[PDB]
Amino acid sequence: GSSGSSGMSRGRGRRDNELIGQTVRISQGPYKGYIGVVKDATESTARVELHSTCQTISVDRQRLTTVGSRR
């Protein structure tokens, strides 16, 4: 039926799983120039799932260049 959670609040500030799902493009490492979706966000790394190799690899959050369609 039509049921829901009394409160519509998930996180107070900015959840570490925010960047999770965004398109990131590796700039460093052996995967330089590779695209992937951030699956997990680490303190000094980020588990991204490549599109081609369709594999989940961890890379420095910084080493990752957040992608974003432009003109």
Side-chain angles (χ1 to χ4, degrees):
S2 184
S3 207
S5 209
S6 188
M8 281 80 91
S9 69
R10 270 87 64 184
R12 298 205 210 67
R14 31 185 300 282
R15 273 179 76 72
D16 31 277
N17 321 101
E18 183 64 73
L19 170 67
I20 286 35
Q22 314 318 322
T23 296
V24 299
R25 171 209 81 82
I26 294 150
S27 166
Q28 305 208 282
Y31 299 78
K32 167 177 88 179
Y34 277 69
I35 306 293
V37 167
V38 186
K39 304 271 86 153
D40 205 41
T42 329
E43 61 186 283
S44 294
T45 30
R47 310 287 197 166
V48 175
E49 170 196 72
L50 286 164
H51 279 202
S52 299
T53 67
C54 66
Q55 282 210 75
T56 310
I57 62 150
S58 204
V59 185
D60 170 31
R61 298 206 276 161
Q62 272 193 29
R63 284 181 186 200
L64 299 162
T65 310
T66 39
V67 192
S69 73
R70 59 86 157 161
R71 71 270 270 189

